[PDB]
């Protein structure tokens, strides 16, 4: 089995100790959230957002890490962008319904702790250069259909990055992404506009 810190509790354990609690908005995510600070170093700080993205993580590590990096920070809301690394099988094979199930468990834990959930559409992806031949495009669309239907049925805000960034093959175009999965600064600026509008309408 695993030898190290599987859920990567060690990544933000120290950072959490100097976060002012109760906090404002926590961004929970994978490499897309983790890549935001190098692209725009003041995005989180100028909006009083807490960045808790960890490269390569699936919804499974996130559900386990959720208590330390979200619940214990007592935020008004949590912005969740997750599922692409589950589609890439980063933590092994997982059925798409079980990926959705992990997101539902995060939503239920947040609601039980009086945290508003802001769900984000999984970004378009046509192929994983690091995991070829997985055909993720339609899997992303199926997962987003479930996320959106859950968000609508439970009065949660849905952030549709996917419709704003997709090309004709339901992937990311070269100007928005270097690997067709992780955004460039141009892609992050599209995302910034959409998520800021969603947060300001949800969080007062």
Automatic annotation (TrEMBL):
Gene Ontology molecular function: phosphatidylcholine lysophospholipase activity
Keywords: Signal
Keyword Phosphoprotein belongs to the record: no
Name this protein carries in UniProt: SGNH hydrolase-type esterase domain-containing protein
Gene3D superfamilies: SGNH hydrolase
Superkingdom of this protein's organism: Bacteria
Presence of the UniProt keyword Nucleotidyltransferase in the record: no
CDD domains in alphabetical order: SGNH_hydrolase_like_4
Domain SGNH hydrolase-type esterase: 27-190
Species annotation: Parabacteroides distasonis (strain ATCC 8503 / DSM 20701 / CIP 104284 / JCM 5825 / NCTC 11152)
